[PDB]
């Protein structure tokens, strides 16, 4: 139809030795990893929040509590797929997703297509409606010092 | 019709003693509050900027350099100027970033306030909240950030 | 048509002595400037990213290598125009652009209308479809300390 809605999402996680690096469902060879409840997939969290926002359904925290047994130990791709099911049942179809990863290292460009493929699979979208961008923070802040990684997302949906 | 536009907004304010904490028009009990020339409702400022941006009307600094007015009156006036340019608001989405206090119990009230100020049904307004994972000035409780996205149409 | 897409962009550059300060294509008189391989125009880079992301064409680094000697000192308006040409080649028309600059200094209000005119010219848009906003970071973080300048952007396009 013509009942479009937009949503936006943000997420950040600390970057310290000890954990694997998983961004967009992709396990990336690195010395440090992202600290969170589960995989701490900062990119999928931001996209999930953008989708809930576009549907005016709250946020990732109110749908998938860390305490909730039904999502104990679920990984962020499963959360993303459950997010999309709720978006559909509210009557919305996803038109496109765009996103940015901000990280001082490692280089993420080799893994962009893998992330796009995971996200498009999880959302049941054609590949050319999913986009992921990645850049450094020019050595500024806790991002520029490699203490964390941030993700931003935007989503467009339409009531159908 | 089909002349859609998007806008994006961003704001941050310092948390300081002696001021009340007002986010999305909701007074939240807390030892500190937001500093600003206005009442410093950082969430309403981000949404205001996103609405000015979507209508290509400039920004909040150019519209409201209204002395003593609160951020809801300024949001109402923002919505008036967006309508004055010929735009209708289709939806608003937003995020609050604050290490403390807990905002989850106040989200539905903020959403109700924004919908009334923008003359929008509840289901076209969304507010999200999270922490900054103890990173940077937000993670140290020194400020609270808000982000907003708005879709308008010119019919 | 009705095939709408949204994109979002982010950029930051350090503010250093001995560099021109070029934001939105405007050379702003100032003792410091933005540091980058190109002219480091943080606002146009953010808008460029939003446009590539809306068209699902990747990001600015994919399209214009930030290490290639041919882009040393590159005019970021020329990069923006080539971005818009590639977005058009992918079948997309640009409907509007919104953006924000975050800086402690200098005062950008005298220059914002000129930046908007530059972006509108590069995107072949009327002025009423381009918006540039400017604010401080309320004294917080490296932005509050004047160590860099941030830009944010959003773009709506449609596949014809
Ligand atoms: C030629 C040129 O400028 N290329 C760029 N690639 N990435 C950039 S960014 N991270 O500053 O937006 S600029
Ligand atoms: Zn997260
Ligand atoms: Zn403010
Ligand atoms: Zn840049």
| Cross-chain residue pair C133–B6, CB shorter than 8 Å | no
Check residue B119 and report its DSSP letter. Answer: T
Q: For Cα atoms C40, C44, C48, give the angle at the middle one, nearest 5 degrees.
A: 115
From C29, C6, C5, C31, select the one nearest C18 (Cα to Cα).
C31
End-to-end CA separation in angstroms for chain A: 6
Q: For Cα atoms B49, A152, A115, give the angle at the middle one, nearest 5 degrees.
A: 155
β-pair type (B87-97, B143-154): antiparallel
CB atoms within 10 A of CB A125: 18
Where are the extended beta strands (E) located within chain B? 3-17, 21-23, 26-28, 32-34, 87-97, 128-130, 143-154
Q: How far away, in angstroms, is A122 Cα from ligand 2 center? A: 17
From B54, B108, B112, select the one nearest B79 (Cα to Cα).
B54
C-alpha span between C22 and C33 (Å, rounded)? 7
Residue B151: which residues within 8 A CB-CB, separation 6 or more? A4, A5, A6, B4, B5, B6, B54, B89, B90, B91, B92
Could you say which residues from 33 to 92 on chain B have a Cβ atom under 8 Å away from some Cβ of chain A?
90-91
Could you state, in order of their start, the residue ranges of all structural domains in chain A?
1-160
Element (H, E) at A81: helix A76-89
Resolution in A: 2.0
End-to-end CA separation in angstroms for chain C: 5
Q: How far away, in angstroms, is B147 Cα from ligand 2 center? A: 16
C53 lines ligand 1 (CB under 6 A): no
Element (H, E) at A112: helix A112-123
Residue C85 tokens, joined: 């040409």
From C12, C38, C34, select the one nearest C21 (Cα to Cα).
C34
Alpha helices per DSSP H over B6-89: 42-54, 60-63, 71-84
Burial of B52 (0-12, 13-18, 19+ CB in 10 A): buried
C-alpha span between B9 and B16 (Å, rounded)? 23
Which residue CA neighbors atom 4 of ligand 1 most closely?
C66
Contact B100, B128 (CB under 8 A): no
Cis before A96 (ω within 30): no
Mutate to test the interface with C, among A98, A104, A135 (most CBs of C within 10 A): A98
């Amino acid at each position: 139809s013509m009942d479009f809605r937009i949503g936006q999402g943000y997420d950040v996680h600390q970057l310290v030795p000890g954990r694997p690096l998983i961004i967009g469902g992709v396990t990336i060879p690195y010395e440090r990893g992202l600290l969170g409840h589960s995989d701490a997939d900062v990119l999928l969290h931001a996209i999930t929040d953008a989708l809930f926002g576009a549907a005016a359904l709250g946020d990732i925290g109110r749908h998938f509590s860390d305490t909730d047994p039904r999502f104990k130990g679920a990984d962020s791709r499963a959360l993303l797929r459950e997010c999309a099911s709720r978006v559909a049942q509210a009557g919305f179809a996803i038109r496109n997703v765009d996103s940015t990863i901000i990280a001082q290292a490692p280089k993420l460009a080799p893994h962009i297509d893998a992330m796009r493929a995971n996200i498009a699979a999880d959302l049941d979208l054609p590949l050319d409606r999913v986009n992921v961008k990645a850049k450094t923070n020019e050595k500024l802040g806790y991002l520029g010092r490699g203490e964390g990684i941030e993700a931003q997302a935007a989503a467009l949906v339409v009531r159908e």
